Amino acid sequence: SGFRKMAFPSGKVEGCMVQVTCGTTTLNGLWLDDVVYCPRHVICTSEDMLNPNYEDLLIRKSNHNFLVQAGNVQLRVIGHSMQNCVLKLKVDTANPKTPKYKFVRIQPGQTFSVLACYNGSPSGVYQCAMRPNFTIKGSFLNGSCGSVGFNIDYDCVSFCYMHHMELPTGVHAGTDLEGNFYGPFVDRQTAQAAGTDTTITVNVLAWLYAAVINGDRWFLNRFTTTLNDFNLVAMKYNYEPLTQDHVDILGPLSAQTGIAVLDMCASLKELLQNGMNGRTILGSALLEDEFTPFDVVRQCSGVTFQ
Amino acid sequence: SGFRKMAFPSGKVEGCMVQVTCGTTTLNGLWLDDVVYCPRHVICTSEDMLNPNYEDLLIRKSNHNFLVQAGNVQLRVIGHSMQNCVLKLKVDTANPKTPKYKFVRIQPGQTFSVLACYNGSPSGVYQCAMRPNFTIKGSFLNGSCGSVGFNIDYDCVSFCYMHHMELPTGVHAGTDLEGNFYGPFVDRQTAQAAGTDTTITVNVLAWLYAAVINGDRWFLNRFTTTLNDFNLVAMKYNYEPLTQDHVDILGPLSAQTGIAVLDMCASLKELLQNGMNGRTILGSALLEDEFTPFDVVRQCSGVTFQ
Numbered sequence A, B: 001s002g003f004r005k006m007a008f009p010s011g012k013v014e015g016c017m018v019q020v021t022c023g024t025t026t027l028n029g030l031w032l033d034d035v036v037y038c039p040r041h042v043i044c045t046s047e048d049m050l051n052p053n054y055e056d057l058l059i060r061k062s063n064h065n066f067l068v069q070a071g072n073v074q075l076r077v078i079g080h081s082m083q084n085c086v087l088k089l090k091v092d093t094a095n096p097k098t099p100k101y102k103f104v105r106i107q108p109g110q111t112f113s114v115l116a117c118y119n120g121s122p123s124g125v126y127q128c129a130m131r132p133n134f135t136i137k138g139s140f141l142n143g144s145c146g147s148v149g150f151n152i153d154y155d156c157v158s159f160c161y162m163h164h165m166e167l168p169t170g171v172h173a174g175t176d177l178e179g180n181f182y183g184p185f186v187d188r189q190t191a192q193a194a195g196t197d198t199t200i201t202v203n204v205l206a207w208l209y210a211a212v213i214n215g216d217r218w219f220l221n222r223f224t225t226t227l228n229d230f231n232l233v234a235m236k237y238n239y240e241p242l243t244q245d246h247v248d249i250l251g252p253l254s255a256q257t258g259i260a261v262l263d264m265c266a267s268l269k270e271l272l273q274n275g276m277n278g279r280t281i282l283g284s285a286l287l288e289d290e291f292t293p294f295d296v297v298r299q300c301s302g303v304t305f306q
């Protein structure tokens, strides 16, 4: 037992991280087969980055303007192209460490692991969620752009995120691996800002089930509620609506604990109206919304990856 | 910016994990050079595990009683011996993926990453602290014994922990890699139990500095306090004492923020006496004590590992 914010083993991804330099800008790239993926703002300078035309900027570059270093071994760039907000740098060597992989785009409310990197060297790993407003609450310093987020499903790495920027509030924004931003953010200096977030309701319920599975039960009650009457309270407290699909997805956790989904909603209702009154759940004094029903089943049942 | 519970990249350790089977018991082992390290209770059965004599049990075993699987490749055991509570299984192949490494024993209050494993396959990675009572609050299911905890310093893996058991309260206990338990726990079925824990004071202060570095300042005040008068309050709330050495170690974080160490103690004093009153710090409504001063400098400054 126990319940922790768990990331996927990062090794398969560590073997893909490289350093990409163009002019005075150094950042991280992802090396799969014979292509290195990196944020296209690598080709911009400080004054470029104000209001740039990336097609103009890129036609002025050459293969030899991109230094790629894979460890202490230089990769030779033999072609380059832009796809949306990422650069694709064709190199003369296929990455011998290429895992089986897919490029997938996730939904707000879904989680993923982040391998933070600087100068192509992995620094740390942690677990994030895509917020309903398409930001993530990460940990990123200057030079971390190009770090990726991913999930692992048996032996296959599903890359979902490439880091691009930090917004004024300290939250982070980036793209999927086809270079399409998550949310209404651009790789130009504007006054862009996050926008109002909500709490991921289905995830809080999943975590409440994790808590029961791990022996925290003080928040349970004999009450129940209808889906509609719960949603009227959820809206009040800036929680997103709960759908029948969410109820179905919470099915297995319901059956394992014997607490009907709508009963746990009644428990959440009372937590929202009363607060926690000195007590904690799974070592938290807040309702945690960055674990999916999948994450809870995985951690509380023990699936591995190979 | 941002601040997350960050683990070290786990790849160097993933390449050392193997499966060890003896009789009907399967668990994880650590394969470095030509030795596989695993918990010695692998040789026990259910009724053995009540009150066992491990020297007796081990002299009755043979090399061929230990099946070691490194992925889908069987390793041949050519020798075995016991060191304290671990087994050392000499195999006929040196692990080609052996990193530079050290076996180190950590102090309560220090942190480390855990690579949870089942059947020799890595499952997830997360960050723990050694509690003052020599337990850790982990996430471990049946079959995870033999998973290890570690830190990385440039390119060298310092292994500090091998998982052995879960105590009745849901917390976890194990050994260093020489097989000496952390704390007063034994690998026999007794009624052993955790014992009273305290909060790691120097770590809370480190995390308060992390918060200031990341823009949370509402808890700051103009007050100050003496070391002795702070410690009188710390004891009341079950915090461990703060020493001049802790003050010296908080030096760099003090200088970076311009908040004298003793001033931040005055801030903590008031948080302890008043609570947080609806507010949060770094996304927590509790005072977090599982980040060291080292961890904060690392994350808020950006060191990598290669």
Ligand SMILES: *[C@@H](Cl)C(=O)N(c1cncc(Cl)c1)c1cccc(-c2cc(Cl)cc3cn(C)nc23)c1
Pocket (backbone or CB within 6 Å): A025, A026, A027, A041, A049, A140, A141, A142, A143, A144, A145, A146, A164, A165, A166, A186, A187, A188, A189, A190, B001
């Ligand atoms: C890589 Cl060069 C990099 O990591 N960052 C960065 C990312 N996350 C946090 C922090 Cl503090 C820095 C980075 C550095 C310089 C500029 C930018 C950047 C990126 C975009 Cl997409 C837009 C934009 C607009 N401005 C002024 N800077 C931007 C990111």
Ligand SMILES: *[C@@H](Cl)C(=O)N(c1cncc(Cl)c1)c1cccc(-c2cc(Cl)cc3cn(C)nc23)c1
Pocket (backbone or CB within 6 Å): A001, B025, B026, B027, B041, B049, B140, B141, B142, B143, B144, B145, B146, B164, B165, B166, B186, B187, B188, B189, B190
């Ligand atoms: C490996 Cl066999 C294993 O992972 N565990 C285990 C570890 N952590 C959590 C859980 Cl729920 C299980 C394990 C399985 C069976 C027995 C033991 C064990 C270990 C020790 Cl050191 C002592 C002891 C006493 N008893 C009754 N079981 C014990 C651990």
